C-alpha cells in the first residue's frame with residue numbers, strides 16, 4: 001500500500017485496538033476509488049483463527065444501508081412509492097393511528113416514535129401485526145426522528161412485497177449478486193462457517209440471535225472485501241450497469257429530513273463536509289443517548305450531495321461496525337470489529353484517517 005495510507009491506518013487503529021480491547025479487526029480504505037486492506041487479531045480466540053480479508057463480521061445496523069438501497073431499487077422499478085401509505089402494502093393494519101404514515105416515514109424513523117426494538121416475544125407473522133396494531137405513537141407522523149429497528153425493518157419487509165420474493169431473495173438477486181458481493185449473507189451458509197468470526201461480549205463468544213425483522217434491520221454478515229466493494233458502489237453509483245440499482249443507490253443518499261447538522265437518507269445518514277468529529281457524533285446515532293429529535297422536512301428531497309460525509313454505525317451484541325465515505329473525494333473507510341466498542345471512538349478513528357488522506 002501507499003505508505004501514507006499504511007501509516008495513518010496503523011497509527012490510528014493499533015491504539016484503538018489497545019484502548020478498546022478489541023479481539024479482531026479488519027479495515028478497508030478506499031483511496032482514489034482502489035481498496036487497501038488491513039487486519040489484526042483474532043476472529044476466534046479459542047481456535048486461534050486470525051482475522052483475514054475473508055472473515056465474516058456481523059454488520060449490525062450497517063445492514064440498514066442495504067435495506068435502504070433495496071428499497072430504492074424497488075422505487076426505481078416502480079414497485080413502490082415512498083409517498084404510499086403503509087396500508088397499501090399491509091391492509092391488515094387497520095388501526096387508525098396508521099392513517100397518514102407512509103413508507104417514507106417508516107424508512108426514515110419519522111412515523112411518530114416506533115420503538116427502537118421489536119420485542120423478543122414477537123415470534124410469528126400474527127405477533128408482528130399485533131405489535132404494530134397496538135403501538136401508540138407519541139407524535140404525529142413527520143415531526144420527530146427516533147431511530148428504530150421496528151421502523152426501517154417494516155419498511156424493508158413491505159418494500160419487497162410487490163416483487164413476490166422473500167426479503168433475503170430480493171436482496172440476493174437485486175443487490176448482492178449484481179454488485180458481486182459474493183461473501184455477503186443474511187444467513188451464513190454452513191460452507192462459510194469456517195470464515196464466520198465470533199463476536200465477544202464480556203469475554204464470551206457470541207453470535208446474533210434470531211429476531212423479528214432481523215434481516216431487514218441488522219442481519220447482514222460480510223467480509224472486508226465485500227464491504228469495500230459496497231463502499232465503492234455507493235461512492236460511484238454511475239458505474240453500476242443495472243439501472244434500477246444505480247437509481248436506488250442515488251435515492252438512498254437523497255436528503256429527506258434535517259435535524260441539526262444531520263440529514264437522513266434511506267439507511268445512510270449524511271452531513272456536510274467539512275465537518276469535525278464532535279459535530280458528527282452529536283449529529284448522528286453515534287451518540288450514547290437515545291434521542292428524540294424534531295426534524296425539518298426537505299421538500300422535495302435533495303439529490304445525493306457529493307460534498308458529504310456519508311456514514312452508518314452498526315452493532316450487534318458482539319460486533320461493532322462503521323462505514324463512512326466522501327463522494328467528491330473518492331474516499332471511504334470500513335471498520336469491522338468483533339467487539340461492540342463505543343461509537344465515538346469509531347468516528348474519531350475514521351475521521352483521523354480520512355482527513356489525513358483528503
Ligand SMILES: *[B]([O])([O])[C]([N]C(=O)[C]C1=[C][C]=[C]S1)C1=[C][C]=[C][C]=[C]1
Nearest residue numbers: 060061116149218313314315316317
Ligand atoms: B443498530 O443500530 O446497530 C441496532 N442493532 C441491533 O439491534 C442488533 C443487536 C442485537 C443485540 C444487541 S444490538 C441497534 C438498535 C438499538 C440498540 C442497539 C443496536
Ligand SMILES: [K+]
Nearest residue numbers: 211212213214
Ligand atoms: K426474522
